[PDB]
Every structure is written in structure tokens, then in C-alpha cells.
Amino acid sequence: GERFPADFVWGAATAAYQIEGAVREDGRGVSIWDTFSHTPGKIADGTTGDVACDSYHRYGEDIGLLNALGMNAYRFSIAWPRIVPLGAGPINQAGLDHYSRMVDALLGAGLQPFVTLYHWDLPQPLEDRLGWGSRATATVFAEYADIVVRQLGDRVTHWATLNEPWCSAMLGYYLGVHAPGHTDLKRGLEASHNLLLGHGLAVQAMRAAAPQPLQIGIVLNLTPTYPASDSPEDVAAARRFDGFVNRWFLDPLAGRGYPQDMLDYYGAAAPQANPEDLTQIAAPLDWLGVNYYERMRAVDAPDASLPQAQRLDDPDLPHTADREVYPEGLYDILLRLHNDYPFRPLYITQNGCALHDEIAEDGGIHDGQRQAFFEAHLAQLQRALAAGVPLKGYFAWSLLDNFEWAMGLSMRYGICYTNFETLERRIKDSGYWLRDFIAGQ
Ligand SMILES: OC[C@H]1O[C@@H](O[C@@H]2[C@@H](O)[C@H](O)[C@@H](CO)O[C@H]2O)[C@H](O)[C@@H](O)[C@@H]1O
Ligand SMILES: OC[C@H]1O[C@@H](O[C@@H]2[C@@H](O)[C@H](O)[C@@H](CO)O[C@H]2O)[C@H](O)[C@@H](O)[C@@H]1O
Numbered sequence: 045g046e047r048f049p050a051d052f053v054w055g056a057a058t059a060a061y062q063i064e065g066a067v068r069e070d071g072r073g074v075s076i077w078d079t080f081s082h083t084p085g086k087i088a089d090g091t092t093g094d095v096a097c098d099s100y101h102r103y104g105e106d107i108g109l110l111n112a113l114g115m116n117a118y119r120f121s122i123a124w125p126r127i128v129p130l131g132a133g134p135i136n137q138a139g140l141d142h143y144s145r146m147v148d149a150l151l152g153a154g155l156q157p158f159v160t161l162y163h164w165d166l167p168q169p170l171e172d173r174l175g176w177g178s179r180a181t182a183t184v185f186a187e188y189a190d191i192v193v194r195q196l197g198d199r200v201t202h203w204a205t206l207n208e209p210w211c212s213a214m215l216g217y218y219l220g221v222h223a224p225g226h227t228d229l230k231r232g233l234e235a236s237h238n239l240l241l242g243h244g245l246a247v248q249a250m251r252a253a254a255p256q257p258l259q260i261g262i263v264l265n266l267t268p269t270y271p272a273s274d275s276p277e278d279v280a281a282a283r284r285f286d287g288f289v290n291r292w293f294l295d296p297l298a299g300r301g302y303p304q305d306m307l308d309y310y311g312a313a314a315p316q317a318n319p320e321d322l323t324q325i326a327a328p329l330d331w332l333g334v335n336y337y338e339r340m341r342a343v344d345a346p347d348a349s350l351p352q353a354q355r356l357d358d359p360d361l362p363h364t365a366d367r368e369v370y371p372e373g374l375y376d377i378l379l380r381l382h383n384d385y386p387f388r389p390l391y392i393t394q395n396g397c398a399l400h401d402e403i404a405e406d407g408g409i410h411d412g413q414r415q416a417f418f419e420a421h422l423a424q425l426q427r428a429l430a431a432g433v434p435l436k437g438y439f440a441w442s443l444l445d446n447f448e449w450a451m452g453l454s455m456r457y458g459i460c461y462t463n464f465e466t467l468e469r470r471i472k473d474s475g476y477w478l479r480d481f482i483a484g485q
């Protein structure tokens with residue numbers, strides 16, 4: 045009841061800005077996250093992605109970790125700023141050559157590359173022209189996608205267009221906690237539409253530019269939502285939050301248009317989604333990736349910002365450094381995708397947790413709660429497979445401790461510990477647990 049398919053993808057995941065550093069090297073342009081990180085007060089601990097894990101130079105060390113963990117895949121992102129530094133403008137061949145070498149190093153190690161094209165590092169020049177608030181950014185995103193697949197698509201079969209458009213749109217343009225840091229609902233919703241349109245345009249451009257058949261998907265963060273009580277007010281709140289995070293993206297991707305309950309709720313703040321756009325958004329996916337960290341147990345919050353839902357913590361569930369642990373939410377969300385939506389196959393493209401990790405006296409990192417996190421979530425994946433869910437792989441978040449966006453370097457999600465001063469990496473106990481679990485397969 046333990047065993048995964050022999051062809052199951054086992055990996056760990058990262059994002060370029062979170063790990064690479066070398067922010068001005070080899071022609072790289074300025075990204076929104078460079079601008080944002082360098083804006084006083086935006087990052088909790090004053091850190092930036094300027095060095096991060098120095099993976100631009102140290103990716104071979106990262107490959108060494110993945111090999112030591114007995115993984116058979118690595119999910120990582122390509123930095124648009126390294127490929128088209130102005131966003132819309134000339135290619136930077138040095139950037140493409142870098143990722144060509146990295147892809148070859150992965151394939152040489154027996155690690156399948158699962159490449160994300162957009163993991164939040166929009167070139168700043170595009171943001172100067174409204175960024176995801178402009179349709180033209182979707183156009184030039186698709187051009188970037190074409191450029192990269194033409195060069196690497198002879199070797200990489202598995203691509204994702206976007207990582208987590210809800211974060212880019214709602215955290216970056218509505219709540220202002222992620223780059224570029226805008227705070228307007230209409231801007232967030234407009235951004236969400238142009239992200240989805242970028243996705244659709246990119247799929248078509250990638251299929252046209254591809255030198256071989258590709259497996260193209262999109263990666264969504266999904267948060268299963270539960271009403272804290274069965275009162276109408278709390279059930280409605282759960283429904284609005286579920287629409288805000290999940291259905292807003294799943295439905296148009298599924299060819300169902302935007303969810304009408306949310307359209308009516310947002311009113312004129314929602315974009316004018318003409319039919320032609322929705323057709324483009326609903327391009328068939330070869331796979332869908334799910335990023336899962338937590339559930340939302342919702343109570344009505346009439347006085348809060350839309351969607352007027354607040355989290356009610358449950359005393360019966362333990363917390364990590366930053367979240368409630370709820371492994372069964374992964375089962376629920378997969379069963380929902382399996383039964384309620386058409387996408388298949390599915391991958392878990394990010395799942396992991398943050399702890400107050402410390403190097404112990406013996407030199408290891410004794411992260412038992414993270415081991416238990418993986419054990420429990422993988423148990424729920426076994427249950428989901430048993431129910432018929434077409435799950436084809438699992439990527440642990442993250443390969444190593446990294447720059448976690450607005451939290452900076454101070455929130456450690458790695459299965460490997462990163463010393464940010466020396467840049468040494470050390471496998472945590474949870475990493476060795478994953479190694480041995482995967483090898484039992
Ligand atoms: O049939 C299974 C595949 O269904 C695709 O979803 C399509 C969607 O692309 C299309 O817009 C609407 C039109 O009604 O139909 C759905 O079935 C998924 O994208 C694939 O992942 C899935 O394999
Ligand atoms: O920096 C830590 C990780 O934060 C996650 O963001 C979660 C998101 O998954 C979830 O859907 C919403 C609402 O429940 O909460 C956010 O905090 C990102 O998905 C990860 O990429 C990121 O590594």
C-alpha cells in the first residue's frame with residue numbers, strides 16, 4: 045500500500061529568483077523581484093535574491109544533492125530576465141546557453157528536467173508598461189516561451205507555462221505583498237486575465253515552435269477550503285474563498301469560463317472576458333501541476349477585504365513555522381480534481397513545509413516534523429492513487445532553503461539546509477527519509 049508506479053516522477057522543486065543569485069551577470073536584466081526586494085520594508089528580513097543560494101554558479105552542487113537524494117527529476121524555472129532582458133526585445137544567447145548546459149548536466153545525471161517558464165520574475169521594463177495589467181505582456185510572454193522551447197525543446201519534454209497565477213495576480217497586484225506590490229482589486233483581476241491569456245497564447249506558440257511533441261501544463265496553488273461551521277454565512281465565505289483562489293483559475297482553464305458567482309461578486313472590477321480570450325485560455329493541457337501547502341478553514345469576515353473570509357485556526361491541528369498541517373487536504377483536493385474537473389494527468393509540483401531548522405551538535409538537521417509532513421502527505425497520495433487519481437509524480441518543496449519571497453531567507457523550506465553565508469548545503473533528515481522511501485520503490 046506503499047508503492048508508487050515504477051515510472052513515477054520523484055523530484056524536488058525550486059524557482060530561479062529564489063536560488064540563482066548572479067542577478068546582473070551574463071546579460072541578465074532587472075526583474076520586478078529585483079525592484080521589489082531592493083525596496084525598503086518589502087522583505088521581512090532585509091534580504092534580496094542578489095546572491096540567494098548562488099545556484100547560477102552552483103547548480104552542479106544542486107545536481108549532486110538531487111543525485112544523493114535518489115531523485116529522478118528536477119523542477120526548476122528559467123528566468124525570463126536572462127533570456128529576454130528587456131521583456132520585449134532581443135534575446136540574450138548567454139542566458140539560453142546557461143540553461144542548455146544545465147539541462148545537459150541534468151540529463152547526464154539521469155534527472156528529467158521539468159521546466160517552468162514563469163515563476164514570478166517579470167522583466168521590470170514590462171512592468172513599467174503596466175506588466176500583467178497589459179495584454180501586450182501576454183503576447184510577449186508567448187514569444188519568450190517560443191524562444192526557449194526552440195532551444196531546449198529537443199531535450200525537455202515537460203514544460204509548465206506559469207507557476208501560481210493567483211500569487212502573481214492577487215499577491216502582486218491586489219494585496220501588494222509580492223512584486224510588483226500594487227494594491228487594487230481591479231488590477232489584480234486584470235492581471236489574472238492577462239496571465240491566463242499569456243498561458244493560452246504560450247501553449248499554442250510552444251506547440252508551433254516545438255521540435256518534438258511536448259507535455260505542456262500549468263501549475264496552480266490550490267487551497268481546499270472548509271466552512272468552520274455549517275451556518276450559511278460561513279459556508280458562503282468558504283465558497284467565496286474557494287472561488288478567489290481555486291475556481292477563478294480552474295474553471296476558465298477547464299473551458300467553463302470564469303465562475304459566475306465570483307463574476308457577480310467582483311462586479312465591474314472583473315475583466316471583460318470576451319469569448320475569443322476564453323477559447324485561448326482553455327487550450328487542452330497535457331498535465332496539471334498542483335502546489336499544496338495548507339487548507340483554509342473559513343469564517344465569514346464581512347468587514348475584511350474581498351473575499352470576506354478569515355482563517356479560523358483549529359486547535360486539533362499542529363502548525364509548522366508558518367502554517368497549519370492538514371495532510372488530508374491534499375487527498376480532498378486531488379479527489380476534487382479527479383471527479384469535478386477534466387485535467388489529467390496530475391503532478392504534485394510543490395509540497396513541503398517550513399521549520400525553525402538548525403544544525404545540530406552532530407551536524408545533521410533533525411527535522412522530524414518535516415519527515416512526518418512528507419510521510420503523511422505521501423500517504424494521502426497513496427489513498428488518492430487508490431481512488432483512481434491519475435497522479436504521475438511528486439516534487440518536494442524545496443530542494444534547498446532559499447529566498448522565500450516576502451519572508452526572505454528567514455523561512456526555511458528545504459529538504460537540504462543552505463548556509464547563506466558560506467553557501468554550503470547539507471541534507472536534512474527529511475531528505476534522507478525521502479531518499480530511502482524512493483529507493484524502496
Ligand atoms: O479529456 C481529458 C483532457 O481534458 C482537457 O480539458 C478540456 C479543455 O481543454 C476544453 O476547453 C474543454 C472544452 O469543453 O474540455 C475539457 O475536457 C484537459 O485540459 C486535459 O488535461 C485532459 O487530459
Ligand atoms: O514562500 C512559501 C510558499 O508560499 C506558497 O504560497 C501559499 C499558497 O500555496 C496558498 O495557496 C495560499 C493560500 O492558502 O497561501 C500562500 O502562502 C506558494 O505557493 C509557494 O510557491 C511558496 O514557496
Ligand code: NA
Binds near residue numbers: 364
Ligand atoms: Na509547531
